[PDB]
């Protein structure tokens, strides 16, 4: 029977396949999860930094609004005294 | 939605508004809560003096925004 | 051939593919099976993001290999 003569040539290669596959599967999974971990962390941090830029830009706007209001208040009240 | 109106005296007024409400409506809502006549109100947002006719969305005023109010001072 | 797609919460999507199919087709198949728009999808294999125009063959993605799906933020 053919698997009997083919056995000696192929059996060691085939008896080790399942381990060779699991090694590559684990190596793929380890490289992807490490990259993904950097992806999620970098994405989350930069989103937080952007939202904090917008917060300070709004606060910088309120301070300028307040000083514009304070100038307008002095100007328009001096006029109608 | 909510917006805030900060007076130069430090006071902070809270108003319930719609994005389609005009600046005239906003002055009317400040009149109800604080008794100040709308003629004696000037509102500033984003370095601009708001015009009675335009709406809050016209000035890109969204929720939690803070407007600044200028009053008449009979000293 | 069959491949597997791991999602962020651990689920596994099963797809019937060919070595010739492009990353676009894969995402389209994920849409048909999971209802996820392709523009939300980021597919990662061997630690690299996969480009819509290349094929599974271009990325040495073989039978029963596992791809990793990471959706994009709504804003950002």
Residue numbers in the entry:
A (entry chain A): 111 to 191
B (entry chain D): 1 to 75
C (entry chain B): 1 to 76
Publication text:
In the current model, the E3 Ub ligase RNF168 recognizes these polyubiquitylated proteins and then ubiquitylates histone H2A, which serves as a recruitment signal for 53BP114–19. Recognition of ubiquitylated products by RNF168 relies on three distinct UBDs: MIU (motif interacting with Ub) 1, MIU2 and UMI (Ub-interacting motif [UIM]- and MIU-related UBD).
To confirm the specific interaction between RNF168 LRM1–UMI and K63 chains and understand its underlying structural mechanism, we determined the crystal structures of RNF168 UDM1 in complex with K63-Ub2 in three distinct crystal forms. This tetrameric assembly (theoretical molar mass of 54 kDa) is inconsistent with the molar mass of the RNF168 UDM1–K63-Ub2 complex (27 kDa) determined experimentally by size-exclusion chromatography coupled with multi-angle light scattering (SEC-MALS). Therefore, we concluded that this crystal form is an artifact generated during crystallization.
